[PDB]
Write an enzyme that holds these catalytic residues in place. Structure first.
Site, PDB file in Angstrom:
ATOM      1  N   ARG B  15       0.722  -1.382  -0.186  1.00  0.00           N
ATOM      2  CA  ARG B  15      -0.074   0.191  -0.041  1.00  0.00           C
ATOM      3  C   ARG B  15       0.915   1.286  -0.021  1.00  0.00           C
ATOM      4  NH1 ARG B  15      -4.477   1.618  -2.265  1.00  0.00           N
ATOM      5  NH2 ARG B  15      -5.416   3.359  -0.735  1.00  0.00           N
ATOM      6  N   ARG B  82      14.189 -12.212  -4.088  1.00  0.00           N
ATOM      7  CA  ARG B  82      14.197 -12.714  -2.777  1.00  0.00           C
ATOM      8  C   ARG B  82      15.382 -11.903  -1.769  1.00  0.00           C
ATOM      9  N   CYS B 153       3.563   7.981   9.452  1.00  0.00           N
ATOM     10  CA  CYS B 153       2.513   9.346   9.178  1.00  0.00           C
ATOM     11  C   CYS B 153       2.138   9.967  10.367  1.00  0.00           C
ATOM     12  CB  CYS B 153       1.385   8.447   8.645  1.00  0.00           C
ATOM     13  SG  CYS B 153       0.668   7.073   9.249  1.00  0.00           S
ATOM     14  N   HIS B 180      -7.335   7.382  14.462  1.00  0.00           N
ATOM     15  CA  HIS B 180      -6.456   6.952  13.235  1.00  0.00           C
ATOM     16  C   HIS B 180      -7.406   6.096  12.388  1.00  0.00           C
ATOM     17  CE1 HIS B 180      -3.218   5.614  10.655  1.00  0.00           C
ATOM     18  NE2 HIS B 180      -2.418   6.441  11.099  1.00  0.00           N
TER      19      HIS B 180
END
Ligand SMILES: NC(=O)c1ccc[n+]([C@@H]2O[C@H](COP(=O)([O-])OP(=O)(O)OC[C@H]3O[C@@H](n4cnc5c(N)ncnc54)[C@H](O)[C@@H]3O)[C@@H](O)[C@H]2O)c1
Lengths: 333, 337
Positions: B15, B82, B153, B180
């Site tokens: 993400r 990897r 963040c 949050h």
């Protein structure tokens, strides 16, 4: 038994009613709501999206309901001044419509023969929190209020900190579940623009007088607390987050021990509870406490500066306190 | 004149890495030329780039090959390795690697990208490396810091706010709450979470207390605040956008209006421009979706009990702000050699 009439059969009205079925000292004998008929009313009792199904026997007529065989009269009257409460032996009216939160209009219930009124919201009347100041009731106070759900959670917490260590100053946030005043989509809210925004898809700042109000139920705390709210998308159960500076030093262990002791006192038994478990909000659904102190979630920066966390089922705890206040003040004549 | 366009590799198209990538497409000061991942193939990568439940559809041409994707004609090599020591970032001109595995936070571990030819690594999370918040301490970067991190963040929201308070009035001590939005580490149903029992409970149906080191970590980017802040979080059911709720004792008396002025002046400064923003409007969380600020001060929601005890409210798109700060930190430190 104290005979009670309910004006406004909403979230609080219907849960006050369910709670009353569990008590032997209070009995709801009449209900008014202008958006219902008796047949619809028993549907709204039977099924509840938050608190589950009611399984007792439910019947209706055109002007009454029957709950486990006991008949309860049903009004459908928009003006309180026109409700013949006295005809049905109603001693206390619970004023839970949300639209008569003024002494001026809530007192019209007395015109029909009710003897006392408890407004289920802050109002310009004497204000009470069970466990904190309900013994200040005087018999001439025919119209009183039970404060807000948030004040009922914060006041027991503030009393324990203030009495043990002394609160110099404090600021409160409540992260609060959705309520009926919020819309499902962005909609008009002339007096509260943020409160018109879609309830389920936003964190919504909101104003609250609860921390100030603690100064009304605990006079020595007058002017020493204030706070605000964030409304968030949950169906029920809210949490208080109180940051305060203490006059005398208190380790986190001393704060825990003070909260635990208080939860075991006659004064706060069932009102202030204590947990050390890894709880989340749904764990307090249908918990009748006014406040549950969360030991593991609360934190201290130091011996004089702390953040205390306390949970409340804003629907069920408050509804049970309304009945507790009725019983408490009924003994004062 | 101008600075060069920094070539970036993304390691971990999860993400955060994917939103860093999307942020870079909206910008011209940086370009991502290579992406590594092991849970995704190139055809699936363009699907995840194209559609976003929070940030909307990407409009622009997306194509894929056996070992690459193309955005608006421009080819981006895709790896599936990897052991990152073999990754030939240098063959593709990669200068910085964004480490968004969500796992790799060991200094030597992240340094493996330098064996392949990358010059520097930015970890998109707290880590045991030098730590930076744009507008607060990014000018402390030294060119021998080949692996650094961009904090969290929440730290990127709190640290600009704390700097303005501390510099204008002086923070004596503070306690912070962050309310949050949901993150990927939370499950949709009650599920095992052995290191965080509360965090395993169903995310969409609970207010969930959580730990956060963000308030303590402010001491790493503002050393004089070390030991003067701590805090906690409540995770709530919203898709994106969070809010810091900071309760502060101040040294110098400050009226609410002076606090508003200090935040407003900071929002106009070169130091904080686009990082700290200011509002007096009746905003709610969805009004900050796709807002790239680290922090927006909410004047109407903040409240003062007295001249020395205040509660400051600051909004942050925890996805989009941080993603743009990662790129800002790449650029800022690239100028220091
Ligand atoms: N919901 C909570 O968490 C909570 C907690 C504590 C206090 N309160 C307070 O209690 C009151 C009720 O809130 P709620 O959440 O139950 O609201 P609600 O909207 O669920 O219920 C109000 C009910 O009043 C009825 N009504 C409206 N006008 C009427 C009138 N003129 N005559 C008769 N009935 C009328 C409506 O049909 C509705 O059924 C409000 O003052 C609220 O602030 C709510």
């Amino acid at each position: 038994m104290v005979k009670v009439g309910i004006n406004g059969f909403g979230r609080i009205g219907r849960l006050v009613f369910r709670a009353s079925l569990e008590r032997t000292d209070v009995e709801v004998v009449a209900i008014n709501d202008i958006m219902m008929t008796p047949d619809y009313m028993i549907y709204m009792i039977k099924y509840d999206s938050v608190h589950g199904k009611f399984n007792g026997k439910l019947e209706y007529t055109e002007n009454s309901i029957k709950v486990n065989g006991r008949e309860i009269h049903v009004f459908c009257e928009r003006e309180p001044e026109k409700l013949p409460w006295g005809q049905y032996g109603v001693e206390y009216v619970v004023e839970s419509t949300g639209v008569f939160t003024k002494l001026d209009t809530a007192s019209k219930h007395l015109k029909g023969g009710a003897k006392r009124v408890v407004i289920s919201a802050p109002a310009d009347t004497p204000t009470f929190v069970m466990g904190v100041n309900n013994h200040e009731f005087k018999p001439e106070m025919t119209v009183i209020n039970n404060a807000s759900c948030t004040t009922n959670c914060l006041a027991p917490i503030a009393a324990v900190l203030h009495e043990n260590f002394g609160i110099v100053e404090g600021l409160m946030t409540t992260v609060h579940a959705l309520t009926a005043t919020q819309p499902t989509v962005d909609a008009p809210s002339k007096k509260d623009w943020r409160g018109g925004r879609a309830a389920g898809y936003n964190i919504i700042p909101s104003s609250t007088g609860a921390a100030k109000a603690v100064g009304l139920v605990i006079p020595s705390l007058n002017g020493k607390l204030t706070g605000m709210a964030f409304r968030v998308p949950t169906a029920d159960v809210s949490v208080v987050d109180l940051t305060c500076r203490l006059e005398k030093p208190a380790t986190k262990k001393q704060i825990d021990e003070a909260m635990k002791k208080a939860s075991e006192s006659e004064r706060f038994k069932g009102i202030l509870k204590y947990t050390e478990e890894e709880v989340v909000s749904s764990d307090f659904i249908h918990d009748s406490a006014s406040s549950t102190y969360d030991s593991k979630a609360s934190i201290s920066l130091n011996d004089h500066f702390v953040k205390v966390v306390a949970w409340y089922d804003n629907e069920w705890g408050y509804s049970n306190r309304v009945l507790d206040l009725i019983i408490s003040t009924s003994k004062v004549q």
